[PDB]
Design a protein around this ligand. Structure first.
Ligand SMILES: CC(=O)N[C@@H]1[C@@H](O)[C@H](O[C@@H]2O[C@H](CO)[C@@H](O[C@@H]3O[C@H](CO)[C@@H](O[C@@H]4O[C@H](CO)[C@@H](O)[C@H](O)[C@H]4NC(C)=O)[C@H](O)[C@H]3NC(C)=O)[C@H](O)[C@H]2NC(C)=O)[C@@H](CO)O[C@H]1O
Ligand SMILES: CC(=O)N[C@@H]1[C@@H](O)[C@H](O[C@@H]2O[C@H](CO)[C@@H](O[C@@H]3O[C@H](CO)[C@@H](O[C@@H]4O[C@H](CO)[C@@H](O)[C@H](O)[C@H]4NC(C)=O)[C@H](O)[C@H]3NC(C)=O)[C@H](O)[C@H]2NC(C)=O)[C@@H](CO)O[C@H]1O
Ligand SMILES: CC(=O)N[C@@H]1[C@@H](O)[C@H](O[C@@H]2O[C@H](CO)[C@@H](O[C@@H]3O[C@H](CO)[C@@H](O[C@@H]4O[C@H](CO)[C@@H](O)[C@H](O)[C@H]4NC(C)=O)[C@H](O)[C@H]3NC(C)=O)[C@H](O)[C@H]2NC(C)=O)[C@@H](CO)O[C@H]1O
Ligand SMILES: CC(=O)N[C@@H]1[C@@H](O)[C@H](O[C@@H]2O[C@H](CO)[C@@H](O[C@@H]3O[C@H](CO)[C@@H](O[C@@H]4O[C@H](CO)[C@@H](O)[C@H](O)[C@H]4NC(C)=O)[C@H](O)[C@H]3NC(C)=O)[C@H](O)[C@H]2NC(C)=O)[C@@H](CO)O[C@H]1O
Ligand SMILES: CC(=O)N[C@@H]1[C@@H](O)[C@H](O[C@@H]2O[C@H](CO)[C@@H](O[C@@H]3O[C@H](CO)[C@@H](O)[C@H](O)[C@H]3NC(C)=O)[C@H](O)[C@H]2NC(C)=O)[C@@H](CO)O[C@H]1O
Ligand SMILES: CC(=O)N[C@@H]1[C@@H](O)[C@H](O[C@@H]2O[C@H](CO)[C@@H](O[C@@H]3O[C@H](CO)[C@@H](O)[C@H](O)[C@H]3NC(C)=O)[C@H](O)[C@H]2NC(C)=O)[C@@H](CO)O[C@H]1O
Ligand SMILES: CC(=O)N[C@@H]1[C@@H](O)[C@H](O[C@@H]2O[C@H](CO)[C@@H](O[C@@H]3O[C@H](CO)[C@@H](O)[C@H](O)[C@H]3NC(C)=O)[C@H](O)[C@H]2NC(C)=O)[C@@H](CO)O[C@H]1O
Ligand SMILES: CC(=O)N[C@@H]1[C@@H](O)[C@H](O[C@@H]2O[C@H](CO)[C@@H](O[C@@H]3O[C@H](CO)[C@@H](O)[C@H](O)[C@H]3NC(C)=O)[C@H](O)[C@H]2NC(C)=O)[C@@H](CO)O[C@H]1O
Ligand SMILES: *[C@@H]1O[C@H](CO)[C@@H](O)[C@H](O)[C@H]1NC(C)=O
Ligand SMILES: *[C@@H]1O[C@H](CO)[C@@H](O)[C@H](O)[C@H]1NC(C)=O
Ligand SMILES: *[C@@H]1O[C@H](CO)[C@@H](O)[C@H](O)[C@H]1NC(C)=O
Ligand SMILES: *[C@@H]1O[C@H](CO)[C@@H](O)[C@H](O)[C@H]1NC(C)=O
Lengths: 362, 362, 362, 362
């Protein structure tokens, strides 16, 4: 089973124990470690952080004691911007320039492939997106013909029905992508006005959630139906939780909230909490395993965080193995308890190690 | 909470360890023990089995050490005959004789009330089935008026949506009934040619499911939605399992079957298995928990059986308490392991007890 | 058969033949004419437009040469505030003030009753909405007891399942209201990115529709199913259409759009078109009757509009009669071709009259 | 567009004007005519009727004036039996003989190809079927490699979901079939106990029919999504109706029935009525266009029949062209008023010619 893992280039700028660099990663932990993100400056694939070229190294050095580890540089990401990408892909001009720059840059940097993280193609870029991947793959071949090891091409697609529909021609692109990562998380926003787990495995109580398709099972399922093969499907699994600030003494699912949740001391970003920050939170908190959804949420004071733990990621892995999917995708190494400290026990990458073990065992 | 348990009056004619009598029941176990079924002969409520009077005897004795235990006589039942019931429902005189015959018959025999087990009113009986309940309650009130402890009136209702829409006016009946037991089991017929748990808590995997309403959760929310007060809703929980005979090596949910499972040694009814027989079956068997449904199934050789155990009833109880229901109803005590034997430890009524415990434990 | 027609107070300000005043309405056309909308200022039901008092009189005049026309004052409306209305229903004191102020304001200004257009009660206002409807009917009773002709109480409910599920306890409110108007229209938002009739009668082609509940039939049947007396259900039918702007040369249902259609010279609101404006659009347009849904749509150049016409409303009246519903509701009189010029024959209210005629014949 | 029309071999043994012979068929009517059915005296496709070999000619003579019509011989039918086919195709040896024995038979009898009517393949026949069609086409090429015009190979398949899943590898079988006639009719059995059109276009009113997939629209789309190519999909249209015998004064859709309708004069088979018997029945009868399904049901006295008229088959034709299908299929040429006397006009094949005109017109 393929175990895809992300690393963000911005997890370095975090206070004390929170800062994370490519060298803090377990060489043997994943089958694919993806660097994110990569910018596109002048229809070309450029670095992002000033030291991205150093870090690109710190990461590839992990291949040294483990030649099985593969790596991909992800281009795009939430920030980049939907429009920027849109243009660079619409005309054939910039599109060829870009496709062109990719192969060498990756080569001259120790990367085993490319990860397309366009978020997301308007309904107007669906045909384009298809081409962009068709051609980009055509190119990846034109380079490896000299006898090299061909560069891997993947994409992080949305898991929400609407988008999946108004942006992807799964049946087609599924052919050129070496594997797909369905980002099955970020399903219940603070705008809804109620508490909701952002990454539930199943729908759960039929009338406790607005629609039937804001969960992992539906997404995974829906996409298989649209033609995506199982062998090219990696199921995303967040190692972060989405929080809210309650507005009443009520604390169950669908309870009233008044905004996202207070910012973690390290990731500092209302609505988010890294697993290691959740671990602190837990002390004195009250955990509730949501029945039909197979995931846990914790509450304490006026805070409510829906997340995943070892038990839930394990459930989640058993789920994918069943559907006999390509494997799990994590987001992101730097959000799990990579130190090994916070969640105690001294062992590190708990949620990802749970995912790792569950994948290899029946 | 209410813990309504059913006791079938034919569980006596069961070979050796199978045979079950009113006296073999834990008088402290339930809050209401319903005896079933009673016939309606000559538009008069009347006994069924040659020795019912003796059994109404053994059962009602259980109220001695435990004065809080209530008992009711259930009239109707699956084999009774859907037609025969309507006949009495729509005859202005048939109904009247019937209603008038109950109060005396109950006081004469020791019951605290009646329970309507009409399966199932037709689309044409929706109204007759509402009048019935309405007048019967009147008769219970008229008889009690002097200063007596009023006779209890309940109805066991279908969990099948189609049935609920064609046969009931939940809205109205709900007010004249003391409680409503919703038969939330028997959801997956063998005629589908595929294995399926007959009593899932939730729908489970979105596509592996037949429809959208063959699971406890839907059934409850629908009835609550339709008007039945939570305080009057009893959630049906089966202590028997639904078996299928496999047709291949596939053993998962949806596997192909060639017919109902093999009859039990004691229940002798293809497609059915008492929990105590499921326990003999479990020896050398493989049990799997169905992820999306919170219920488990077990397979061995060419038999597949979906049933409930301590774990699943606990969740179902957790579920019902969350929904703030009136309690759980069990069908039936003579299908739970009542000798205590069959499942080790030799403790009696594992299922009901597990339910009892979970009902008063938070 | 009841024929409830809405008259908006803002259609008075439209340019040219668009300006619509109460005295421009056919006094024999409808059975009930609801004036909309009225504000609630300082917990008191009040006028909205500076000259509401003048217009109320122009409307109520119509009752003269015809003493069977009933009129109502609709309070609420889309532009009112799901929140403002909530704080008045939640506060026990505010609720009384309001309820108390209605009978006088109603008798004073010459109205037959009230119409509640709270769009829409939150997940948390379900019971408050019921209480609010309960107590207001309790007042219209008290005020009429001396011997007066009881003030009428109605409500314009959502046709959308999600909304209906989180705000309406149909069973209960349905017994206090005199009739319910189900707004069966506004079903395919332009956000979907695709063309789609906003008021289909049935789902039509299965895989060409977004969901199973966005159509009249489902809504009508869902409410009936939920306990609303057909005798009290008024099926809304729209005299306006919802436009879009095509992004390609594709013009059938499901074609990609780039946003709402161009605004009309008179209604001047993107994505909306009154019928009389549609009659203008049809000049050199191409009308197609969507088969599975019984409703038309027209397209010309890059505009696409899904509306209702005489043939389609007739089908709709047929559908409601087979269903045995209290009648039809029309939103709005001023969006129909009230002048009678645009749509030919110089006959006025072509759509509404078609509705009336169809109701009258069997 | 193709136009496959079947001919029954038993359409001769019928009284008076009800006798149908190959020489009675309009040679410029269909583009294909499938003689049905043909037996197999154990691994060798042997005729069925004593004069079968005489009729094969009568049909074929129709090629003399219209050299551009083709004929296939259909082997199977409803009576051939489920087991006979399975047992004959399951035996690797038994098969070969059959496959090998088909071509020479057709070639010697003027038939241009085969048609497979296996009703139906259980779960234990899915692959066999796939193979049978596979190897079957293989042989057709071999025999035709000299320079001869190749033999066609079509298949009549169930339009019912459950049947399709449990037995059709649409993805594969479709690459070998020159075309697929989807038997989109026979949805409502008399076992249901209520009236219902056996061949609706769309499901119509949501709570007036059991499931979402017992109509033409669903079946087709379902098939298309399963891999069936619109270019290789012929949609069946029935030229007969399905009668029921009413049990009360209710005559609408879903009114109670007490068995199938009285046998037709000429077809002499309960629950069935050919169009010519229907046209007759229609005198003094009342027709009703079922609103959501685009189909008529007529009722007179205690009889109820749902069927297709010119108006409705034309709608279904517009439907398939919208779905860009291979064409329409009919059943059967001897059920349509081939006489031209029953439906008056003195014109022949009223429905099929309506189907034809409609196919080439827009
Ligand atoms: C069900 C549905 O469709 N709902 C919509 C939501 O999907 C959507 O939310 C956005 O969802 C995307 C993925 O679907 C998400 O981005 C991916 O996931 C991670 C984690 O959120 C992102 O990581 C962030 O990266 C940025 C830099 O670009 C950092 O600034 C930020 O700190 C990171 N946050 C975390 C938790 O790590 C990645 O960018 C991306 N991963 C990959 C491989 O592409 C967006 O973050 C979601 N939006 C946010 C910020 O909440 C939502 C949009 O608001 O709309 C719903 O309708
Ligand atoms: C979703 C849906 O619509 N499901 C339909 C099923 O409801 C229906 O199957 C019948 O379901 C009812 C419960 O609603 C069931 O009867 C009740 O439940 C128990 C459990 O079966 C019955 O026990 C049997 O009693 C008879 C005598 O009355 C005995 O002969 C038999 O041995 C008993 N079996 C067991 C396991 O104990 C009770 O009769 C009754 N209990 C109460 C409280 O009233 C029927 O038995 C189910 N039918 C059968 C025989 O399977 C199904 C129609 O068959 O249709 C589904 O769609
Ligand atoms: C299936 C589903 O749930 N869809 C949701 C939509 O229903 C919802 O859109 C809003 O829907 C309500 C009724 O369903 C509608 O309000 C009523 O309908 C009329 C006609 O649209 C409204 O008329 C408008 O009134 C405002 C001021 O009140 C005017 O400014 C405007 O010009 C009027 N438009 C027209 C064409 O006349 C009335 O307000 C009201 N009438 C009654 C009987 O109460 C809202 O207007 C709809 N909102 C909009 C902007 O369309 C939608 C909202 O987000 O969400 C969907 O999911
Ligand atoms: C949802 C679903 O799948 N529904 C099931 C039904 O399919 C099934 O009913 C049988 O359906 C098949 C079609 O799929 C039907 O046979 C075809 O259709 C015609 C007319 O139905 C048949 O014609 C008859 O043939 C027999 C002998 O072959 C003659 O004796 C008789 O005179 C003929 N009658 C007519 C109308 O001409 C054909 O045999 C066949 N056509 C082709 C090209 O293959 C069966 O007749 C249907 N069975 C009946 C008679 O009801 C049903 C089984 O009970 O189950 C549903 O669920
Ligand atoms: C806007 C963005 O890309 N994200 C921000 C980060 O880039 C930023 O990191 C800091 O970047 C600057 C360069 O832009 C680093 O400064 C460099 O420091 C080295 C020290 O050896 C020196 O040789 C360079 O001259 C100097 N760069 C220049 C030319 O200015 C700085 O070290 C980075 N931060 C640190 C201390 O690691 C951080 C803020 O620091 O914010 C991100 O949002
Ligand atoms: C169809 C039905 O009601 N259920 C069946 C049971 O009735 C049946 O049980 C036996 O029924 C007979 C007849 O009612 C019983 O006979 C009576 O036995 C007593 C014993 O003291 C005797 O005094 C009576 O004279 C005698 N009466 C009759 C009518 O003959 C018999 O005791 C019952 N035996 C059992 C098992 O208790 C069983 C047969 O095993 O099958 C049920 O399906
Ligand atoms: C926001 C709103 O209520 N809708 C807008 C309308 O109010 C507006 O109508 C105009 O409103 C003004 C203010 O009420 C009217 O002025 C009044 O004119 C009469 C004339 O006899 C005079 O007696 C009043 O004193 C005066 N009111 C005061 C105190 O200012 C004005 O006549 C209205 N215009 C007309 C003729 O319709 C319209 C204008 O476009 O827009 C609505 O959106
Ligand atoms: C079992 C079967 O094939 N289905 C039955 C039909 O065969 C049957 O039709 C009649 O079949 C007989 C043959 O069995 C025909 O008789 C033939 O008549 C000709 C006259 O020229 C004579 O030369 C033949 O020798 C003779 N057959 C023999 C060898 O005995 C008879 O004409 C057929 N009837 C018709 C209408 O043509 C029908 C009804 O009889 O029932 C089917 O079940
Ligand atoms: C990415 O490229 C854009 C376009 O040239 C540029 O404006 C931006 O600075 C680049 N991103 C960063 C911050 O390196
Ligand atoms: C039930 O009563 C009816 C008389 O109304 C009778 O026909 C039937 O045999 C009785 N069944 C039993 C076993 O008592
Ligand atoms: C409606 O009443 C509210 C509160 O009294 C007020 O703020 C608002 O301006 C009023 N609207 C109009 C136009 O009367
Ligand atoms: C072949 O068809 C004939 C009809 O003439 C039938 O009687 C026979 O049973 C079929 N197969 C055999 C050889 O039995």
């Amino acid at each position: 089973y393929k175990l895809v893992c992300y690393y963000t280039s911005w997890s370095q700028y975090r206070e004390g124990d929170g800062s994370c660099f490519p060298d803090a990663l377990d060489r043997f932990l994943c089958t694919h470690i993806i660097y994110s993100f990569a910018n596109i400056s002048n229809d070309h694939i450029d670095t992002w952080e000033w030291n991205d070229v150093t870090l690109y190294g710190m990461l590839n050095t992990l291949k040294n004691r483990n030649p099985n580890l593969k790596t991909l540089l992800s281009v795009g990401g939430w920030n980049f911007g939907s429009q920027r990408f849109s243009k660079i892909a619409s005309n054939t001009q910039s599109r060829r320039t870009f496709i062109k720059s990719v192969p060498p840059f990756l080569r001259t940097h120790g990367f085993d492939g490319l990860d397309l993280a366009w978020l997301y193609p308007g309904r107007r870029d669906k045909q384009h997106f298809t081409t962009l991947i068709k051609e980009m793959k055509a190119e990846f071949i034109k380079e490896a013909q000299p006898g090299k090891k061909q560069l891997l091409l993947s994409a992080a697609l949305s898991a929400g029905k609407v988008t999946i529909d108004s942006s992807y021609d799964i049946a087609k692109i599924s052919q050129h992508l070496d594997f797909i990562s369905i980002m099955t998380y970020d399903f219940h926003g603070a705008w809804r006005g109620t508490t909701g787990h952002h990454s539930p495995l199943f729908r759960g109580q039929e009338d406790a959630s607005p629609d039937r398709f804001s969960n992992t099972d539906y997404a995974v399922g829906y996409m298989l139906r649209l033609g995506a093969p199982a062998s090219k499907l990696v199921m995303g699994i967040p190692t972060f939780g989405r929080s809210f600030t309650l507005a009443s003494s009520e604390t169950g699912v669908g309870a009233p909230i008044s905004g996202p949740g207070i910012p973690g001391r390290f990731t500092k970003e209302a609505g988010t909490l890294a697993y290691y920050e959740i671990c602190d939170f837990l002390r004195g908190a009250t955990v509730h395993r949501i029945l039909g959804q197979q995931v846990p949420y914790a509450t304490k004071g006026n805070q409510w965080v829906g997340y995943d733990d070892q038990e839930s990621v394990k459930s989640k892995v058993q789920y994918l193995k069943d559907r006999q999917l390509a494997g799990a995708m994590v987001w992101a190494l730097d959000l799990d308890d990579f130190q090994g400290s916070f969640c105690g026990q001294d062992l590190r990458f708990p949620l990802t190690n749970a995912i790792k073990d569950a994948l290899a065992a029946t």
